Design an enzyme around this catalytic site. Structure first.
Site, short mmCIF file in Angstrom:
data_model
loop_
_atom_site.label_atom_id
_atom_site.label_comp_id
_atom_site.label_asym_id
_atom_site.label_seq_id
_atom_site.Cartn_x
_atom_site.Cartn_y
_atom_site.Cartn_z
N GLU A 22 0.82 -1.21 0.00
CA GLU A 22 0.00 0.00 0.00
C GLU A 22 0.84 1.25 0.00
O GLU A 22 2.03 1.15 0.33
CB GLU A 22 -0.89 -0.03 1.26
CG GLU A 22 -0.11 -0.25 2.55
CD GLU A 22 -0.95 0.09 3.76
OE1 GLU A 22 -1.43 1.23 3.93
OE2 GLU A 22 -1.14 -0.79 4.62
N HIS A 24 -10.20 4.63 3.96
CA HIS A 24 -9.51 3.80 4.94
C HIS A 24 -9.73 2.31 4.84
O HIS A 24 -10.10 1.63 5.81
CB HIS A 24 -9.91 4.26 6.38
CG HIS A 24 -8.73 4.89 7.03
ND1 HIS A 24 -8.60 6.23 7.31
CD2 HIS A 24 -7.57 4.32 7.43
CE1 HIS A 24 -7.44 6.50 7.86
NE2 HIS A 24 -6.80 5.34 7.92
#
Length: 108
Positions: free
Chosen positions: A71, A100
């Site tokens: 990520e 998120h």
């Protein structure tokens, strides 16, 4: 720097690595980043958190034998981290999340 969704998606698919402005969470911590104080910009100017493995525990991203996910923070400049992330696989599929890691959409 390169910290936009298109900028890092195209840079990763091409160079098969993140741009130079990214650092892992443990690299940031060693330099003095304290998540509770949102001081990343003060201790590592011009850098964003990126390159850490994303477990994908909850199975939301497509799996495959030998595929691993990483990520990177997107649109970060200063202050506390935001909720925008780019998810990239070892085979260079690129997904984005703006909430998120709740939901993801394919961008490359």
């Amino acid at each position: 720097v390169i910290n936009t969704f298109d900028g890092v998606a195209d840079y990763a698919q091409t160079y098969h690595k993140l741009p130079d402005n990214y650092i892992t969470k443990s690299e940031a911590q060693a330099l003095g980043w304290v998540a509770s104080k949102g001081n990343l910009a003060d201790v590592a100017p011009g850098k964003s958190i990126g390159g850490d493995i994303f477990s994908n525990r909850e199975g939301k991203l497509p799996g495959k034998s030998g595929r691993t996910w990483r990520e990177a923070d997107i649109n970060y400049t200063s202050g506390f981290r935001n909720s925008d992330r780019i998810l990239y696989s070892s085979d260079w599929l690129i997904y984005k999340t703006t909430d998120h890691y709740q939901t993801f959409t394919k961008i490359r």
